[PDB]
Amino acid sequence: EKKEKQIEQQKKIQMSNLMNQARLKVLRARDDLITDLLNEAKQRLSKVVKDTTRYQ
Amino acid sequence: SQSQGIQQLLQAEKRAAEKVADARKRKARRLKQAKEEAQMEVEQYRREREQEFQSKQ
C-alpha cells in the first residue's frame, strides 16, 4: 500500500508540475509576442527618423 | 515370583511415557511445519502482490 500510494502521489506531483509548466510556457510565449511588437515599433521609429521633415 | 509384577508395571510406565513423549515431539514437529507452511503462503501472497505492484508501476 505504501509503494502504491507513493506511485499515486508521484503521479499527482509530476502531472501538476507539467500543467504548471504548460501555463508558464504559454505566458512566456505571449510575452515574447509582445516584445516582438515593441521591437517592431522601434524599427518603425528608426524608419520615421529617416524622414527629416517629420522628424523635425 | 513377586518381582514380575513390579517389573511389568515399571516397563508399562516406561512404554506409556515414551509414547506420550513421541506424541509431544509430534506436536512440536507439526507446529513447526505449520510455521513453515505459513511462511510459504506468505511468500505466495508476496509474489502475487509483487506482480500487481509491478503492473501498477
CB of B56 less than 8 A from some CB of A: yes
Q: Which three cell numbers stand for residue A47?
A: 524608419
Cα B34 from Cα B18, distance rounded (Å)? 24
Flag whether residue B55 sits within 8 Å of chain A, measured between CB atoms: no
From the CB of residue B32, how many other CB atoms can be counted at a distance below 10 Å? 10
Which residues of chain A have a CB within 8 Å of the CB of B56? 4, 7
Resolution (A): 3.6
* Solved using: cryo-EM
CA distance A43 to A23: 31
Whole-angstrom Cα distance, residue B30 to residue B36?
10
Is the Cα dihedral A40, A43, A48, A49 positive or negative?
Answer: positive
The DSSP result for chain A, as a single string, is -HHHHHHHHHHHHHHHHHHHHHHHHHHHHHHHHHHHHHHHHHHHHHHHHHSHHHH-
